[PDB]
Amino acid sequence: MTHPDPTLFGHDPWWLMLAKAVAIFVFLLLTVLSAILIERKLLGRMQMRFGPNRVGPAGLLQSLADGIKLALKEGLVPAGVDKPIYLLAPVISVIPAFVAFSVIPLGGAVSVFGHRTPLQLTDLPVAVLFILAATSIGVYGIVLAGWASGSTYPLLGGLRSSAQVVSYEIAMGLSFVAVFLYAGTMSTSGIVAAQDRTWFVFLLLPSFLVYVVSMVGETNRAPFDLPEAEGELVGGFHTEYSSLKFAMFMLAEYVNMTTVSALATTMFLGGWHAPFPFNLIDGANSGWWPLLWFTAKVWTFMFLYFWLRATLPRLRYDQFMALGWKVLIPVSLLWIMVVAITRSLRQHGEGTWAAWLLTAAVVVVVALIWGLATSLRRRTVQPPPPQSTGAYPVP
């Protein structure tokens, strides 16, 4: 009822919660070590390459090889950097990334060695916003790495990280609201339980889209990989970083990818419930299979990430922020209002009045957004005048 379920959470023996934390840590490490190689190979395929396929069998060790190489590489500390913050920034990026994933439901209750415990490190009454807070703290690593490096390109990268926050933070916060509204809680276990009837992706599609866009932004992934923007700022904020400090920045980014995709699964795709083809199968939602389904959904989001990288340029961060404040925020806010009214009407028996509203509202939005797209702006044309430099005649 009142999630977190008090009969499941907060009763682990010290060793068992230690082991669950360790397992989550190792799972995130292996997930990142996978995502690296899988992303490179999938990008290769999307570009008709093979990607890494030599280092170790089938190229398995390539991510591990890169990690160990960065470990074995000289630890640079450039002069002209704020040494303390220059060394802290990777830590500030890493710690919150790992912390956020604590309240992610990787499964339902299971009886490990007699102890009935969740396949989830823990859960909080405000878990979703706790993840949001951890991710927000994580951006300080990016910004302070940019600033403390004392070089123009890292400085610009860090400023782009600040702008990135200004773009995605409010959109993400608003996107959470509709899920809270249909769930009646902020715990992730409660949000998954509330999705037994149906996944909120079908119900809260606008919220899902806004959250996913703000997500791709939050992790600094293409087409919003602006803080790095190798094509503009060379290496962005992680210029001036080498070896395990750069490796920590990138591991933090990939763990943020994993955390936000796991949240997306948790609060829009039934969390760990088996998809439809296995929904009818006995015990598909029990034992360890929920872990498989959760990882499958998370990795579909990972695929979406890689696919975005392989098929889109990167916006200018001003364009992205204009997206966030002119499309994402208005759409999320109006969706929150529409969904609230819809639920109030359904609870008041109005019935059709809600359906007429809901369908109409999006229909209106889909128009006015196109208005800001083609039908009213961003699709105009002009001319110009010549100067005194004896210009030719344009046919």
Binding site: T2, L132, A133, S136, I137, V139, S162, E169, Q387, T389
Partner: protein, 230 residues
């Protein structure tokens, strides 16, 4: 009234962080350091709120003040400087000592007024948080404190109006577009087509290096206007 020794440990470490962060906010001579210290203090106070049976308040603290300190850091970079190390030297005769005395006295007096209070009855918050901390906050905010919640909208609107009136710059001061710049007697190219590059010398190729004219003099145009020669 003594809360669990775990809460004691949490308070001690986190409040140490918070107090040091406030002290650094006041004392750090680089404004960015002061911003980071403020972020630390806000994070610590959020942790304390969580520890005091106030989860939602602490989490919102972390979120909103992450945002706020990010913006304050941006404004430090804009208006103060990127790594400017302020003097913090008393400019008002004896003001520093007077401020230290007044602050210390006010702190001592406030501590004296607070004195021992918890010994007079400390009703735990369990009866309140039961049913949902956020649920209780919603009950209060939209039932008893509905009027204040409504007036927060007035606060928001006034902030927006102030920002627009004092910060937003209308057409008159709008910067010219690249499109606009290329035009007007072919600006930026008719004129020194692309201004001459800074000179390249053995042992010196930085942007601050002025280029050499045929007679051997240094071309003023090669080095940007803002640089202090070389």
């Amino acid at each position: 009234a003594r809360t669990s020794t775990s809460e004691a440990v949490v308070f001690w470490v986190v409040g140490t962080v918070a107090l040091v962060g406030a002290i650094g906010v006041v004392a750090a001579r680089k404004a960015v350091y002061s911003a980071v210290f403020l972020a630390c203090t806000m994070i610590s106070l959020a942790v304390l709120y969580i520890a005091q049976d106030a989860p939602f308040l602490g989490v919102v603290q972390i979120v909103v003040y992450t945002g706020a300190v990010m913006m304050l850091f941006l404004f430090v970079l804009m208006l103060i400087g990127v790594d400017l190390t302020e003097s913090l030297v008393e400019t008002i005769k004896g003001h520093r000592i007077a401020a230290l005395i007044a602050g210390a006295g006010f702190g001592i007096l406030v501590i004296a007024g607070i004195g021992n209070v918890s010994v007079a009855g400390f009703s735990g918050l369990a009866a309140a948080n039961s049913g949902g901390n956020v649920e209780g906050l919603a009950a209060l905010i939209f039932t008893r404190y509905l009027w204040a919640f409504e007036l927060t909208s007035a606060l928001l609107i006034t902030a927006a109006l102030g920002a627009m009136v004092l910060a937003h710059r209308e057409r008159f001061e709008r910067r010219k577009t690249q499109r606009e710049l290329a035009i007007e007697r072919f600006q930026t190219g008719g004129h020194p087509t692309p201004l001459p590059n800074p000179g390249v010398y053995a042992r010196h190729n930085s942007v601050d290096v002025p280029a050499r004219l045929p007679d051997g003099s240094e071309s003023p145009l090669s080095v940007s206007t803002i640089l202090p020669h070389r």
